[PDB]
Amino acid sequence: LFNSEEDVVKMSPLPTVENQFTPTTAWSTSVGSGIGNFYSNLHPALADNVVYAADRAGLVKALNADDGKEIWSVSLAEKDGWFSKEPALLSGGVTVSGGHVYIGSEKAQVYALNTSDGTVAWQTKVAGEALSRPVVSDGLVLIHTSNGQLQALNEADGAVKWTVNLDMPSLSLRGESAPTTAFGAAVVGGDNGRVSAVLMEQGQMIWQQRISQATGSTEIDRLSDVDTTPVVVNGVVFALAYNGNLTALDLRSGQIMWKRELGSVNDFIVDGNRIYLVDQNDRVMALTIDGGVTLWTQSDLLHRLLTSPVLYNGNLVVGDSEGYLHWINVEDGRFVAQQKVDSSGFQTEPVAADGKLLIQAKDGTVYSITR
Amino acid sequence: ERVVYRPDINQGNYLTANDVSKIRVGMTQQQVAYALGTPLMSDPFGTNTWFYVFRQQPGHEGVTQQTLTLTFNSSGVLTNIDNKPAL
Amino acid sequence: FVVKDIHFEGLQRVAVGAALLSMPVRTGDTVNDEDISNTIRALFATGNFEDVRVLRDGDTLLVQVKERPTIASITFSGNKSVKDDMLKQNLEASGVRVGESLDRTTIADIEKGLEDFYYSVGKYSASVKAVVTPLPRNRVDLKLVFQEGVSAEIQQINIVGNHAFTTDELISHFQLRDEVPWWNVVGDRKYQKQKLAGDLETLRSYYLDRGYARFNIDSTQVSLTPDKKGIYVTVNITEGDQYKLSGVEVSGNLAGHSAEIEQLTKIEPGELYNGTKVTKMEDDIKKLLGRYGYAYPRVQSMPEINDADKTVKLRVNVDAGNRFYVRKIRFEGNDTSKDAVLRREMRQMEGAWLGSDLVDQGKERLNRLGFFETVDTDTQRVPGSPDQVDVVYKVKERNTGSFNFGIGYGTESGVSFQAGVQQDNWLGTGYAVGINGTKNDYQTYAELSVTNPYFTVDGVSLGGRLFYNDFQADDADLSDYTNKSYGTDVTLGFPINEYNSLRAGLGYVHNSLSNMQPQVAMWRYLYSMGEHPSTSDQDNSFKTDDFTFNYGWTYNKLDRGYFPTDGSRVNLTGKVTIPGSDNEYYKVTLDTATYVPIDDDHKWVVLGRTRWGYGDGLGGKEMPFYENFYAGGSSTVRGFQSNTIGPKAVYFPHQASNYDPDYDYECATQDGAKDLCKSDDAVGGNAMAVASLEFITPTPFISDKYANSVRTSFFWDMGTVWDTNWDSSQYSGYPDYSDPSNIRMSAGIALQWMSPLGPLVFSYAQPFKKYDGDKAEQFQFNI
Amino acid sequence: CSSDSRYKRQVSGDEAYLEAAPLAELHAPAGMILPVTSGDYAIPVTNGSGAVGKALDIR
Amino acid sequence: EVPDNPPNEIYATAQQKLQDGNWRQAITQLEALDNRYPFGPYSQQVQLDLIYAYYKNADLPLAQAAIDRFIRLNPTHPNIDYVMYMRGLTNMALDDSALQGFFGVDRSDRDPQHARAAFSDFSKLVRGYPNSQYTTDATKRLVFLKDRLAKYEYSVAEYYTERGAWVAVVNRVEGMLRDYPDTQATRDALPLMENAYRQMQMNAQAEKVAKIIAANSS
């Protein structure tokens, strides 16, 4: 076993460590089996000066975002049913919108947890569990669930505004579509390497736009999890295909303004014309909004376990499941700081909110990070 | 034989009492074959003659038999339903 | 331009004219300039061509074909878990092989399809690299390079849309087992999507038998987890709102067997619906029509599932065939054995209807043969009347002959040897013979044992066995032990039922002894014989001619005669003497071998092999001491040495054995260790109770093409042999075996190695507890 | 080194099909002649010449 | 052995290791002759030499594949007269083989599997090459081939007579009838069906056979 089962391929743990602005934690408030090693789109937010934190198999916390000491905690480990004390099992993120904490759960169920205490301000089961985090918006609980459904529930009680189908998968092509609202349309990505827009009023397809490759005869890896979410610069949608092919496209029609069918990208942010991104090999590039003009790039992150990148403390910040945080020179690609603040590591979206930079790690959980 | 146990010998391709009623003298081979099928023995060098014989042996006792021979003409039109019992 | 001479450069595998006929312009055709370009591409339609340079010398064609013909090898690297032939199958899938039209255009298409094969394994994290590497003058090697990162494995099962049934029991139904702990270690792992489809019905039938007759699976979402291993799965199902089987209205072409059909439709109207029970009940009718000749038992149902009372109503539409389908039969795979011995190993007769069981029961007897590799058949409906189904009995036959070892002095200490071998139907003629014998300075043993198992057509088993043991244990060829013994065994096989079978025979043993040992169990037998010689010497002789009567009986409902896995065969046998025998005694026994499936897929089966035996005198006598019961060594309490488990006698105070040699074979003798020395060898008892409990273990690391007839098994081995006639006053200061509790203990593993002259059973057993006088060789090699 | 038993080991074979002979053919009376040949039991009996048995050449 | 050499150098060593008795080498020559040069001028003669190297090394299915190869390499070739005979001569030897022949143990009631295959190919020879040097050979094989099938099918009609499925007797006897009239074993099966008739009280149908017995007394 120990000297026999061996066959691996390349990986880099952490090349290029820097501490030019020496990074710290703003506080550490580890919650438990939070995000977990388990792949699920439950991830925290930061609001109300309250770290509304969670365990995905246990306690749903709320912690004072000064020190992360507890505002409240409840447990959505559902205590009865045909499964009889099943754990929390959260598929959608910690969507704290108003006095509810909306979380898509892996019961195919969406609990709005009342932000004052954590009582379920409403619950409502949806068609499939939340492949994307609940985009609670405009009275709608807009969720790309696992079956490629866009559901819209009421965010006050769960009254289902609609449930429409998105760009389908083939097996479960986990294209995080995260159905945004732009130009009065529920703007939403895809699973087959497509993208679309449907109506924000009833889920009425404004247009469906195939972008690029997916599984089946132009197949992509099991690692492909690519967030196909629209980042709409309102006239021009910027979104990914499921093979990570970057695309500028119309919102009224989905007509491709330009697309990188050269990109195979995992995480992406459009920072003005500075499209900072994370490729399949966790390789970082700064593209433009005209195409793929590399403003800068980085292989200091290359074959990593990265999170989404964020502009914070003047640098591109990104964690990894190796527990390293990485402050990247937004000028060019270099570490300006590196923080190993955990070892269970990060796959959450880093929440640069309440003035902080909130992450919940996998099991070495919630840390606020600063430099 | 001073042995009372004999493993029983059986043999079908016969006619039941229901089978003889399906046919009568006049019916062609086909008409019999629509009624009874074709037996697993016919007259190889003689005329159309359809041999449906039962055979069965019991333990230490005498062998049963129900031979039912369907002798047609050359046209196959039934001419003789020749039933023959055991012995 | 019209060509006078086409110049055909670069030709190895394809012909010159095969190029020229592939040229749209031949030598002398009307040549166009695009036809020259068509002479480029239509030559590339050979597939063996790298470049085709159709130039013309004014009009004189010069076609410089560069070639990629026969791929002179294909090589592989990095595929530790993956067979190269499976990758060669992908090359066979992509139309390329060794010696083929090379295409360097499909290299990634290979490696994609290799990865798409590596997909279908249950991985994707693996490297693939077809490398086109040249071989003589234009030929090539296809070098294949692999860095296999990780497969995929069962991680998570999400079931939404279930309303009653816990996924823990559902994973317990399915083969999505994903837990092998470190201190609670159990079971295995490693996903395959081909198991998944059966795991869908392992849910579905499980809902079907519950009543869920509106059960459907809505959808299924198996996680493409960003790790290239992670298999989580969301399934959406619609539970099925349980129904009651509430009435059977079976009809159709019931062939007049409607009441017997109604016995097969004896249901409870209103119990929770079980379509699986409905499913097999149709097959009972298909057996019932199969019983009555109808090999066309078209029996379909309609479960009119009534959702208003939450019930089911059972329409069943039946159609029979005709009776006399068994027209004739064929027998195949007897190129070296007799056909008719297989035909008399069969129950269904030609010129009859279908007895659906009798072909299988005949095949069951042929399964109980064990001189076969395969028992199967081909049951061909010959087209014609509905009385024409012929039956090819396609079967394969197995190995023959097996020598038995134990021989050796180095082949240097005189002319001393051991033989022994079996004949195995005598080449499929119909005569199973097994013959052994050994002539040394210490013995001269003769034996034969032959049966005509079908001396008559019923299975009269003309089992003729002989022996001549001139056993001459050597101190001067006397003075250790003399016994010349000789005689026969003719014993016959009886039909009792078709799984029941009696045995009876008679025996001749004339033992002729001299120089008899001082040990009490002889002498207590000698005095039970009423023969009282002097025990301080081995001067003592004995001439006996015991005439016994053999008898026995056999059960037969265990599977195979060479590799069984389920069932049992009871082996009752015994002997008793007659008025006229030179000793009046008996000896009875029974041996068991049950095959109980731990795994009912028979990768784990209980093999309870036990042995019993008892024999004493009929009155005023005793059973002879050579008829006492032994164990150890190769026995079912192994790891010992042979005849080490059992009672232990004591020599009487002794002297010269008619000259016991100078300090050799000490038997309380004058030459060493005088005056009531003891025998620590298993002299055996009048009672036998020994056993082995074996458990079928699979072998994963072996090519299972031949490990399938290799049976490795674990055991504990324990047993007791003792004498109920044993003394506790002359074995008062000695091992007493009057008690039944003389229980030995051993454990270990055996390895049956399937060799082409019979399987080879080698076993390391380890005696845990060994009782009085046991002697051990833990490593035993056997047959 | 073998008496009655053919040293320098070999495997058993067959050529007796040419070395055999036919048997008596049917002579059945009238009305009792069924057709008695099917398939290539009707031998395509042709004797365009050349050697037989062991005498036959092998290329 | 023998890589991409001169083919005649491969072929000389092929003909040499044929004449050496190194058929296992000569096979490996004639393979490496056609592994490199299957387009050789004697590549059909290679197949004639391969079967010659196969049969003298007792490689009947390898011969039979090379027989199929000679068909698939040259289905119009006149040396199918060898090869279709060799197709029989494989299948004549492919059928039965045992060491019980010194004891006189018959294997004509063993399975005539490739004998039924040799029943085709020897007849396909004397059909396809009714003039060949192998033709006078193969016809006499077919004489015993139907007679091997006689004692094959005679062995089971006795068994059904021992079984007492008298319909199954007359089925094997009429199959013995309707194939080979030239066998005495059918004329010895002649009372058996008649006895099976007489057990089935088709004594009259048996008496039809009794005059056949009267006609087949000579």
UniProtKB/Swiss-Prot annotation, chain B:
It is found in: Cell outer membrane. One of its GO terms (molecular function) is protein-macromolecule adaptor activity. The keyword Aminoacyl-tRNA synthetase does not apply. One of its GO terms (biological process) is Gram-negative-bacterium-type cell outer membrane assembly. It is a lipid-anchor. Keywords: Cell outer membrane, Lipoprotein, Membrane, Palmitate, Signal. The keyword Lipoprotein applies. It comes from the Bacteria. Belongs to the BamE family. Part of the Bam complex, which is composed of the outer membrane protein BamA, and four lipoproteins BamB, BamC, BamD and BamE. This is Outer membrane protein assembly factor BamE. The chain holds residues 24 to 110 of 113 of the full protein.
Curated annotation (Swiss-Prot), chain C:
PROSITE patterns: POTRA (PS51779). Residues 1-68, 69-149, 152-240, 243-321, 324-398 form the POTRA domain. Its main location: membrane. It comes from the Bacteria. GO terms for biological process: Gram-negative-bacterium-type cell outer membrane assembly; protein insertion into membrane. It is found in: Cell outer membrane. Disulfide bonds: none annotated. Gene3D superfamilies: membrane protein fhac, membrane protein fhac: a member of the omp85/tpsb transporter family. It holds the Pfam family Omp85. One of its GO terms (cellular component) is Bam protein complex. The keyword Heme does not apply. Keywords: Cell outer membrane, Membrane, Repeat, Signal, Transmembrane, Transmembrane beta strand. Belongs to the BamA family. Part of the outer membrane protein assembly complex, which is involved in assembly and insertion of beta-barrel proteins into the outer membrane. Constitutes, with BamD, the core component of the assembly machinery. Part of the Bam complex, which is composed of the outer membrane protein BamA, and four lipoproteins BamB, BamC, BamD and BamE. This is Outer membrane protein assembly factor BamA. It comes from Escherichia coli O45:K1 (strain S88 / ExPEC). The gene is bamA.
UniProtKB/Swiss-Prot annotation, chain E:
Pfam families: YfiO. PROSITE patterns: PROKAR_LIPOPROTEIN. It comes from Escherichia coli O157:H7. Keywords: Cell outer membrane, Lipoprotein, Membrane, Palmitate, Signal. Part of the outer membrane protein assembly complex, which is involved in assembly and insertion of beta-barrel proteins into the outer membrane. Constitutes, with BamA, the core component of the assembly machinery. NCBIfam families: OM_YfiO, PRK10866.1. The keyword Signal applies. The lineage of its organism: Bacteria, Pseudomonadati, Pseudomonadota, Gammaproteobacteria, Enterobacterales. One of its GO terms (biological process) is Gram-negative-bacterium-type cell outer membrane assembly. This is Outer membrane protein assembly factor BamD. Coiled coil: none annotated. It is found in: Cell outer membrane.
